[PDB]
JSON list of C-alpha atoms in Angstrom, two decimals:
[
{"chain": "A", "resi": 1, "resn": "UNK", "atom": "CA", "xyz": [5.72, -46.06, 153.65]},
{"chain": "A", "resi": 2, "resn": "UNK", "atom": "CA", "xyz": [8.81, -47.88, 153.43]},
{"chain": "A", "resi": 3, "resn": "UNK", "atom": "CA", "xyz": [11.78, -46.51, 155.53]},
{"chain": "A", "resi": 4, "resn": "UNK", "atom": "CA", "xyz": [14.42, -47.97, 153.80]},
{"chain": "A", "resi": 5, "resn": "UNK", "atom": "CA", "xyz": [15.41, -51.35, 151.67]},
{"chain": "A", "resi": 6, "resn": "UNK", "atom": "CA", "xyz": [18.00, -53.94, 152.03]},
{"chain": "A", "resi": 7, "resn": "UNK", "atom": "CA", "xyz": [19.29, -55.43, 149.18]},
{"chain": "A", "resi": 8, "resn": "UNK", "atom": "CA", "xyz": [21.85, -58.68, 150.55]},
{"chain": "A", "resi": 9, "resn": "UNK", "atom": "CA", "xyz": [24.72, -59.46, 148.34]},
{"chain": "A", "resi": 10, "resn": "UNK", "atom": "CA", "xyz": [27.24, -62.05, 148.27]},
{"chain": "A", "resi": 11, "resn": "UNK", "atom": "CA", "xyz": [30.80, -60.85, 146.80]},
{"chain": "A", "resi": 12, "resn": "UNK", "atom": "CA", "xyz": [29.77, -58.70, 144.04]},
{"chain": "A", "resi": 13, "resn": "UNK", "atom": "CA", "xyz": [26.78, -60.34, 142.95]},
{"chain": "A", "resi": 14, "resn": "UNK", "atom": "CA", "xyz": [23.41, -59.36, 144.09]},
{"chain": "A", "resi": 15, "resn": "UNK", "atom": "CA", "xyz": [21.55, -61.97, 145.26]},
{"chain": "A", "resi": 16, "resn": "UNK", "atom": "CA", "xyz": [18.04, -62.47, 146.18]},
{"chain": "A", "resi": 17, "resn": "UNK", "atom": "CA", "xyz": [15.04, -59.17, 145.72]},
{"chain": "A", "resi": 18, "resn": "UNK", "atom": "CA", "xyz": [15.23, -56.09, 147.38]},
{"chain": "A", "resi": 19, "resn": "UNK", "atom": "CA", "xyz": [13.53, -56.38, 151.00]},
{"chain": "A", "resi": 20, "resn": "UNK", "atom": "CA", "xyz": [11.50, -53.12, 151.73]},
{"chain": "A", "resi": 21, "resn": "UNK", "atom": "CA", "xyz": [11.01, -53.01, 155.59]},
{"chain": "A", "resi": 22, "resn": "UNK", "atom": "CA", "xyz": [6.83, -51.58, 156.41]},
{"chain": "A", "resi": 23, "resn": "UNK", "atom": "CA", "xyz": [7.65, -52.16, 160.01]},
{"chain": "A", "resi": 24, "resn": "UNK", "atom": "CA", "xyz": [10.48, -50.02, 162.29]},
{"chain": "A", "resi": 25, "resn": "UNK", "atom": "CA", "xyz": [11.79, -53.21, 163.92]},
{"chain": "A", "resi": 26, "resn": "UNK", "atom": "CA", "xyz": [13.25, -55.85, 161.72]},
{"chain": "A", "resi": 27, "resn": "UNK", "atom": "CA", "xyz": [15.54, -58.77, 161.98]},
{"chain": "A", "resi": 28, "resn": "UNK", "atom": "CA", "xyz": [18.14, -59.70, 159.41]},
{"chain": "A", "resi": 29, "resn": "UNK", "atom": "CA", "xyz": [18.54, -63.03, 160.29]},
{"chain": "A", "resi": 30, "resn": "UNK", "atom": "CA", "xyz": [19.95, -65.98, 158.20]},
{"chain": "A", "resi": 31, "resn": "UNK", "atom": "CA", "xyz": [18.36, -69.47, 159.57]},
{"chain": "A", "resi": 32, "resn": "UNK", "atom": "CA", "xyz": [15.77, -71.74, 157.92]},
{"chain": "A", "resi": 33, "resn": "UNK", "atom": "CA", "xyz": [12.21, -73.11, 157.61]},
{"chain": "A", "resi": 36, "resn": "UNK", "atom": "CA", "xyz": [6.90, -65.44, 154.80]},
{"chain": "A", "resi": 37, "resn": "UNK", "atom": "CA", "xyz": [7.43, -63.40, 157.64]},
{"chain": "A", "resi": 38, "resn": "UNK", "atom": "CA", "xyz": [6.82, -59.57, 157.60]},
{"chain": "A", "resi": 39, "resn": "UNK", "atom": "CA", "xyz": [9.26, -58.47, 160.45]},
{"chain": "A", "resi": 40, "resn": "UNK", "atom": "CA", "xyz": [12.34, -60.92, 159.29]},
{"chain": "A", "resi": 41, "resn": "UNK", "atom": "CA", "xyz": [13.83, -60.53, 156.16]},
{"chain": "A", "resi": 42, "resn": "UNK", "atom": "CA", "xyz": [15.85, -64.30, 156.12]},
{"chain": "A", "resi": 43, "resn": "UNK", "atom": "CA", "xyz": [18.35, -64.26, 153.85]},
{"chain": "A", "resi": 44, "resn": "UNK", "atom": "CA", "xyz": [18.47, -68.36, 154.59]},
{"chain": "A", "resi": 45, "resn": "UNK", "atom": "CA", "xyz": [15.94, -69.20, 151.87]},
{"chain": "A", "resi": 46, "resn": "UNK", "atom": "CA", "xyz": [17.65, -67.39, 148.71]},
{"chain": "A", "resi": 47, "resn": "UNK", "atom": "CA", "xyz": [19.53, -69.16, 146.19]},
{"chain": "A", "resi": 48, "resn": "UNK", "atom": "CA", "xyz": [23.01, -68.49, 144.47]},
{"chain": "A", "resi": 49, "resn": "UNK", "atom": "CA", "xyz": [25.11, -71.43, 142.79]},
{"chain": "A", "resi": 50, "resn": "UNK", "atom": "CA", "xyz": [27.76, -69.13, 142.79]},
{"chain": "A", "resi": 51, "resn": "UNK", "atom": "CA", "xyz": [27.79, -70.39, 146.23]},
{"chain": "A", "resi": 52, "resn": "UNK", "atom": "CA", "xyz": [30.70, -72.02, 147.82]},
{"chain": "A", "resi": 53, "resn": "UNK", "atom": "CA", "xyz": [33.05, -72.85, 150.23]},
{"chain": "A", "resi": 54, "resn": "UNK", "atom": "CA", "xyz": [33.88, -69.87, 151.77]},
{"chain": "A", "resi": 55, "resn": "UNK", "atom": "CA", "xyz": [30.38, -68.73, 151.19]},
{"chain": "A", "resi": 56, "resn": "UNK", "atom": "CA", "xyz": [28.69, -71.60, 152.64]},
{"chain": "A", "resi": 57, "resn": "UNK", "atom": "CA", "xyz": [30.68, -71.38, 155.55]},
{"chain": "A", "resi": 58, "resn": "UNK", "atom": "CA", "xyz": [30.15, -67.58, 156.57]},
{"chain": "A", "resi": 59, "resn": "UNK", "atom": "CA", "xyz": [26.26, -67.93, 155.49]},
{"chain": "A", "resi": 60, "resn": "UNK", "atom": "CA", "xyz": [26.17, -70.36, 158.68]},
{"chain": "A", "resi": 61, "resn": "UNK", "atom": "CA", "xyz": [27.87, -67.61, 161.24]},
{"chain": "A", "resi": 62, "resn": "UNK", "atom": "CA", "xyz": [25.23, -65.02, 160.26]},
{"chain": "A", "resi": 63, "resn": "UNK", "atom": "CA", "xyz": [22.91, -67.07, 162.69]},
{"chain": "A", "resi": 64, "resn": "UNK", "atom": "CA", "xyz": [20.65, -64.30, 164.53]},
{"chain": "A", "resi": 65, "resn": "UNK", "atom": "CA", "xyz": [21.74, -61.72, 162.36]},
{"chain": "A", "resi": 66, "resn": "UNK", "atom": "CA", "xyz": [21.06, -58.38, 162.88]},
{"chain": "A", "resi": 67, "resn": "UNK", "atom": "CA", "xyz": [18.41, -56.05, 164.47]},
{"chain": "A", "resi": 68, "resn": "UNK", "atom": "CA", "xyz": [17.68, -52.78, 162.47]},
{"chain": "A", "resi": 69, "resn": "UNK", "atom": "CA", "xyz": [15.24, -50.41, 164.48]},
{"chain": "A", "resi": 70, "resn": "UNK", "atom": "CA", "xyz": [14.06, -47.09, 163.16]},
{"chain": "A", "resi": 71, "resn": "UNK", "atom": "CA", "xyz": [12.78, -44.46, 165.61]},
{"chain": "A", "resi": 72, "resn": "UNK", "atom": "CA", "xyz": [11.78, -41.09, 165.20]},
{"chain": "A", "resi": 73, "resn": "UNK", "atom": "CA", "xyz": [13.82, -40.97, 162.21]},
{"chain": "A", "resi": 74, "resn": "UNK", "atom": "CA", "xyz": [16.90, -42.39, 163.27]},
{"chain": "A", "resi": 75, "resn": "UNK", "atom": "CA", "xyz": [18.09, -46.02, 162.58]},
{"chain": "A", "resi": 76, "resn": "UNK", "atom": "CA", "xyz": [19.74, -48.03, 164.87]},
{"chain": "A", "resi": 77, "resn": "UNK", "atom": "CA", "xyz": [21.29, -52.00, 164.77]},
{"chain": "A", "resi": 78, "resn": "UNK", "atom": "CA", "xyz": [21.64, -54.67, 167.24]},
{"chain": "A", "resi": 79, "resn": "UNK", "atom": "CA", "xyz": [24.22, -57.41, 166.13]},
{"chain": "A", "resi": 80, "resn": "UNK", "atom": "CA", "xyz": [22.11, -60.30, 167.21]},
{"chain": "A", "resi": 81, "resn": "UNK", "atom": "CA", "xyz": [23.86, -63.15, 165.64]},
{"chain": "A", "resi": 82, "resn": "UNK", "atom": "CA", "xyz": [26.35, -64.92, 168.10]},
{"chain": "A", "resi": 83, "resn": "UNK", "atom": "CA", "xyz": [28.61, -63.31, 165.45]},
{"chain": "A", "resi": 84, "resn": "UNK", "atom": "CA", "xyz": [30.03, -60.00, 164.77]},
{"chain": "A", "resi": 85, "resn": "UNK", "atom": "CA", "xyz": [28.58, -57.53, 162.01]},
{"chain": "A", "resi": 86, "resn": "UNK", "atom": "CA", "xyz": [30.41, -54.80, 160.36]},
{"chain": "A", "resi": 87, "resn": "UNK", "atom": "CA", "xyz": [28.96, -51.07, 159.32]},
{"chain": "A", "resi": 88, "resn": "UNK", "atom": "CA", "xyz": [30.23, -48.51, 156.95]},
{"chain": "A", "resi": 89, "resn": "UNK", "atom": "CA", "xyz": [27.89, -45.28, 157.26]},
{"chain": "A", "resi": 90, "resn": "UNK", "atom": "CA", "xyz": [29.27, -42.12, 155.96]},
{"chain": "A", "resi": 91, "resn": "UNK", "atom": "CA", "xyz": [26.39, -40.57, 158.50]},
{"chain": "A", "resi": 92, "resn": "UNK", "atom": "CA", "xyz": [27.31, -42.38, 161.40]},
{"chain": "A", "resi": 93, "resn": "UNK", "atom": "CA", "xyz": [30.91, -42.41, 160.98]},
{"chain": "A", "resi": 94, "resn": "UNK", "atom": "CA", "xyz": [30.86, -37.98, 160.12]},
{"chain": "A", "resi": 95, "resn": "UNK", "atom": "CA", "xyz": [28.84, -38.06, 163.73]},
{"chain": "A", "resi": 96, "resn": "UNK", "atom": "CA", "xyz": [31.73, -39.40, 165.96]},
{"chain": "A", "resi": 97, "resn": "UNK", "atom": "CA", "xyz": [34.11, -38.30, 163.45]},
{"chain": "A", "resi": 98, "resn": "UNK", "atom": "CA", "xyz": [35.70, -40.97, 162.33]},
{"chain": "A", "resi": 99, "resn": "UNK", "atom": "CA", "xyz": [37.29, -41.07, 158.73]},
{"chain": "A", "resi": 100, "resn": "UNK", "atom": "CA", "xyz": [34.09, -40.76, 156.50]},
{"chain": "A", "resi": 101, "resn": "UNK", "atom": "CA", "xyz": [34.73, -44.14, 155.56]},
{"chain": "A", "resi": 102, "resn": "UNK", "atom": "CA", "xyz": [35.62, -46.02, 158.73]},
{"chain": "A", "resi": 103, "resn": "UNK", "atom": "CA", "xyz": [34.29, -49.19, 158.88]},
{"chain": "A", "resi": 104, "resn": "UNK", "atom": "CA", "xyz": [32.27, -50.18, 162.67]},
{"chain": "A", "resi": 105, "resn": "UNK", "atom": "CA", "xyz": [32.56, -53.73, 164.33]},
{"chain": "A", "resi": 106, "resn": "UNK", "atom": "CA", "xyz": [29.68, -54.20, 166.07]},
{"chain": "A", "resi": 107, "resn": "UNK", "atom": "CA", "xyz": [30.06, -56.89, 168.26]},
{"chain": "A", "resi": 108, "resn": "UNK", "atom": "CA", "xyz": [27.86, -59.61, 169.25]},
{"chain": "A", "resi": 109, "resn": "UNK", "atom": "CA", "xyz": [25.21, -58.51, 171.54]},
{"chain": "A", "resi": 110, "resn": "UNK", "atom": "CA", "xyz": [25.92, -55.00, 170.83]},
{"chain": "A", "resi": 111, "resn": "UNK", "atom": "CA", "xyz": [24.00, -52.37, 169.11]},
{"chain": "A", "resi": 112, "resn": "UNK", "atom": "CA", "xyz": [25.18, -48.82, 167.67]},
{"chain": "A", "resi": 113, "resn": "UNK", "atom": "CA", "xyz": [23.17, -45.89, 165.85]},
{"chain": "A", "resi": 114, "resn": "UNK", "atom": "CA", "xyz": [24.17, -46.18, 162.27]},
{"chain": "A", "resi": 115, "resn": "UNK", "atom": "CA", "xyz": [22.07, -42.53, 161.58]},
{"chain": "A", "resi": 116, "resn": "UNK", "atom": "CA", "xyz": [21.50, -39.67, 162.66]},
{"chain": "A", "resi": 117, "resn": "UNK", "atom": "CA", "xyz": [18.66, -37.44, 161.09]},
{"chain": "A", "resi": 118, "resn": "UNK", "atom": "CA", "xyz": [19.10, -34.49, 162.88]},
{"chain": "A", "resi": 119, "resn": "UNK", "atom": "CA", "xyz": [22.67, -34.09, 162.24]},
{"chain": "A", "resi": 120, "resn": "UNK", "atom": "CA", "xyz": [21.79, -34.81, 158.14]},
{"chain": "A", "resi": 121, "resn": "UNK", "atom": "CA", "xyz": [19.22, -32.17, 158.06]},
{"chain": "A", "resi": 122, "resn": "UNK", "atom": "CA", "xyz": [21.91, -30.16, 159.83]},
{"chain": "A", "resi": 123, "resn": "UNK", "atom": "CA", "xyz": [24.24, -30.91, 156.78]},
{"chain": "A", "resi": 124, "resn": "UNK", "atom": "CA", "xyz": [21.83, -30.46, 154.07]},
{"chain": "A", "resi": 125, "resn": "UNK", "atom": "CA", "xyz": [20.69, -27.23, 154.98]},
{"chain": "A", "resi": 126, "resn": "UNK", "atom": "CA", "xyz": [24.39, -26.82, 155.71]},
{"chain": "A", "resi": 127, "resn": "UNK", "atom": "CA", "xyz": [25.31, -27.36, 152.10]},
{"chain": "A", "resi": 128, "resn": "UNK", "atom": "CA", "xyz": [22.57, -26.23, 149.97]},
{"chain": "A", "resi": 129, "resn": "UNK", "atom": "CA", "xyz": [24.16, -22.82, 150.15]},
{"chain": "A", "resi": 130, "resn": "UNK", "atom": "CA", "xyz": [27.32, -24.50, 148.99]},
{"chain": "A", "resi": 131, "resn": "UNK", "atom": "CA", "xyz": [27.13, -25.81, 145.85]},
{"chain": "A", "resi": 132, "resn": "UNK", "atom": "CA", "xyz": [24.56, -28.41, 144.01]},
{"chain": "A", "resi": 133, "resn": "UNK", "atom": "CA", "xyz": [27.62, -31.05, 143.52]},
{"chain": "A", "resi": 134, "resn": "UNK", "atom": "CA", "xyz": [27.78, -31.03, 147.10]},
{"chain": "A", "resi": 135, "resn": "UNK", "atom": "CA", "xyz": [23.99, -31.15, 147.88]},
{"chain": "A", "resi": 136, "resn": "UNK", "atom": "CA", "xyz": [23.99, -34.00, 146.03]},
{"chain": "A", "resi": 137, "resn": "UNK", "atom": "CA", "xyz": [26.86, -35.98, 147.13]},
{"chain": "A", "resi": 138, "resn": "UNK", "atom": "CA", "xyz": [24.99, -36.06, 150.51]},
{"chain": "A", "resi": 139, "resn": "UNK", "atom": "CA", "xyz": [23.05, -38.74, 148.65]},
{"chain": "A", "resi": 140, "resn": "UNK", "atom": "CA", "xyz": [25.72, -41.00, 149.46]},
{"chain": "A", "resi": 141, "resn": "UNK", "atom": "CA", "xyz": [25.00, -40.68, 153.19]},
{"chain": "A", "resi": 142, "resn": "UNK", "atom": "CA", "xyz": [21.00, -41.87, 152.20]},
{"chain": "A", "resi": 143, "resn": "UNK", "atom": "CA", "xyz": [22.60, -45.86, 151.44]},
{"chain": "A", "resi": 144, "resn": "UNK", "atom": "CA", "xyz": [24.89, -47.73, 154.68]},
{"chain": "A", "resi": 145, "resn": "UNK", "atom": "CA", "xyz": [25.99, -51.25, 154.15]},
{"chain": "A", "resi": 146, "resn": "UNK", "atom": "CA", "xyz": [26.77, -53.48, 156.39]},
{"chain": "A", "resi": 147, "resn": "UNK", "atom": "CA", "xyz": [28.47, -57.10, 156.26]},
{"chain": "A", "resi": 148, "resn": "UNK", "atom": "CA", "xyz": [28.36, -60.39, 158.04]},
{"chain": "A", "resi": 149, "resn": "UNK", "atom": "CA", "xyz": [31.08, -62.06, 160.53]},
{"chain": "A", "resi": 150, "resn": "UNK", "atom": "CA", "xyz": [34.36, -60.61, 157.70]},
{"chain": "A", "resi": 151, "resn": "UNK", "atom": "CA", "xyz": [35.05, -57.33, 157.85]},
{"chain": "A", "resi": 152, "resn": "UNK", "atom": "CA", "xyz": [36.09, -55.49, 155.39]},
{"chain": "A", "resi": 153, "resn": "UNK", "atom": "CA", "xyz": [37.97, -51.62, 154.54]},
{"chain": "A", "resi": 154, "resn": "UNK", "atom": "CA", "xyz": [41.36, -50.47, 156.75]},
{"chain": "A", "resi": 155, "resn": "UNK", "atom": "CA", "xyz": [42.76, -53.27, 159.23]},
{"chain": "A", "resi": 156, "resn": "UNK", "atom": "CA", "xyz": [41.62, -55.68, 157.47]},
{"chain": "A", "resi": 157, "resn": "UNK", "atom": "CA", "xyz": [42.76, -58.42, 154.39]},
{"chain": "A", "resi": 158, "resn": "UNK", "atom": "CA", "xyz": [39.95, -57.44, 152.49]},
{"chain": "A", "resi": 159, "resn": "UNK", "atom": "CA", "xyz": [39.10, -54.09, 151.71]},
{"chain": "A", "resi": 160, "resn": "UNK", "atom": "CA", "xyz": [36.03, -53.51, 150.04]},
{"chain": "A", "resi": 161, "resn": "UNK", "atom": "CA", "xyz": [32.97, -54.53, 150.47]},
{"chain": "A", "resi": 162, "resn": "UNK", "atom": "CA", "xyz": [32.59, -56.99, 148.15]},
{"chain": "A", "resi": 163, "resn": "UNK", "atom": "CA", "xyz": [35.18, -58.92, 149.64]},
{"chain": "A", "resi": 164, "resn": "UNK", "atom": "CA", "xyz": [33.32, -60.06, 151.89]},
{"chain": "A", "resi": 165, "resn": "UNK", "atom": "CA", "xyz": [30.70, -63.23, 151.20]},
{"chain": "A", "resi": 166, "resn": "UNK", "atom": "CA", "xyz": [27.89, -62.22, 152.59]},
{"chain": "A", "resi": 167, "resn": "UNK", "atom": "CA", "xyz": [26.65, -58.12, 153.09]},
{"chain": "A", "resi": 168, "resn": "UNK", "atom": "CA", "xyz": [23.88, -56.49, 152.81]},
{"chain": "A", "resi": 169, "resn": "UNK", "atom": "CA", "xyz": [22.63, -52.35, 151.35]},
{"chain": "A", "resi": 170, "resn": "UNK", "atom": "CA", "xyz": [20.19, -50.46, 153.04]},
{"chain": "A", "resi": 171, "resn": "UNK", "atom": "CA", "xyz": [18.38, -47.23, 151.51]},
{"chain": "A", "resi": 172, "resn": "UNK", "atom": "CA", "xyz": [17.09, -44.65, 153.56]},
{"chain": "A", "resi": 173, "resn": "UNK", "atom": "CA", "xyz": [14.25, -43.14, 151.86]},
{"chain": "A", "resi": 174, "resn": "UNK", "atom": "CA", "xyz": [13.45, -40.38, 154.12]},
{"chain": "A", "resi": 175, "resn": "UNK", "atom": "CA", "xyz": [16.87, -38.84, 154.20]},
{"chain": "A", "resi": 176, "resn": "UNK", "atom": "CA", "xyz": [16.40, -39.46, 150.17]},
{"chain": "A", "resi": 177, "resn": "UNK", "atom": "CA", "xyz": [13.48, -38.00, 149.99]},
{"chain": "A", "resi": 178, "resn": "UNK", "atom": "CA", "xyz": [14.64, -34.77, 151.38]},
{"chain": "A", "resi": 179, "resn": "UNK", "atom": "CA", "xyz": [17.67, -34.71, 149.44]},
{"chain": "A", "resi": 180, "resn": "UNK", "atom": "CA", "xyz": [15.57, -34.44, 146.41]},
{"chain": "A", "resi": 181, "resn": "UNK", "atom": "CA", "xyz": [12.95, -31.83, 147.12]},
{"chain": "A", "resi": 182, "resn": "UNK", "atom": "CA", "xyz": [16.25, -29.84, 148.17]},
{"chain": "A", "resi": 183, "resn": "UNK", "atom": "CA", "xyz": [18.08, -30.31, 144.43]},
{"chain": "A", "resi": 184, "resn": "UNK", "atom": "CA", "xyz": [14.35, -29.92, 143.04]},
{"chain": "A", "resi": 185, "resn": "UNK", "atom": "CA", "xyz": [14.60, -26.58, 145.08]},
{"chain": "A", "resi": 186, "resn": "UNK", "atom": "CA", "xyz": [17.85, -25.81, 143.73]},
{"chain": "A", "resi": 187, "resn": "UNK", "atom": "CA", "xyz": [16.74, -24.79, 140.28]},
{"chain": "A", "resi": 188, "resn": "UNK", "atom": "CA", "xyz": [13.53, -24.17, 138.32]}
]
């Protein structure tokens, strides 16, 4: 029912609940003053706040787009500034490091998963090991950041250096995943 589930974070603290997205086209936005299709992270709370907090929570403006089709996710960085995604699925697609981390700038938009190529790595691994079945869970979670980045060529280089990010959940691709371990042994 639920394709996936952003969970926004500010350094390493978890802030607000988990968002679970019943709609294919939602906005991560961050402005002010209920709304199914937006998920605003403007109206949660942290005192942890700060500074440096405050001010990036202001560049997030129009956020970002996440649109799921046909099983594939995509993002538009909406927000007049940039956005920056880490998917091990996305990033084993155009072969980049597993763990490259993607700028996508303002106004752009980039397809942070793949399904077909997943299934094709699943069924790819099952014969291959249960360790390795599994580790594919990591490709089910991306998480992308606001305006910092984060990882190589950059100060900071994990995600929790940044002030403001946000975890998303793909429950199909976990779904899968698990009827395949289930699979795996009885």
């Amino acid at each position: 029912a639920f394709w996936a589930s952003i969970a926004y974070y500010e350094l390493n603290c978890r802030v607000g609940e988990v968002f679970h997205c019943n709609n294919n086209s939602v906005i991560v936005d961050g402005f002010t003053n209920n709304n199914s299709d937006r998920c605003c992270l403007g109206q949660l709370s942290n005192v942890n706040r700060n500074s440096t907090i405050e001010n990036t929570r202001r560049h997030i403006g129009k956020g970002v787009h996440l649109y799921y089709v046909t099983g594939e996710v995509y993002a538009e960085c909406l927000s007049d500034s940039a956005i920056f995604v880490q998917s091990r699925n996305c990033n084993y697609h155009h072969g980049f490091h597993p763990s490259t981390v993607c700028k996508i700038p303002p106004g752009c938009s980039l397809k942070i998963f793949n399904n077909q190529e997943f299934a094709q790595l699943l069924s790819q691994s099952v014969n291959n090991g249960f360790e390795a079945v599994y580790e594919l869970t990591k490709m089910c979670t991306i998480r992308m950041s606001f305006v910092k980045g984060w990882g190589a060529e950059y100060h900071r280089q994990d995600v929790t250096s940044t002030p403001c990010w946000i975890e998303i959940h793909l429950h199909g691709p976990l779904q899968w995943l698990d009827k395949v371990l289930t699979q795996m042994g009885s």
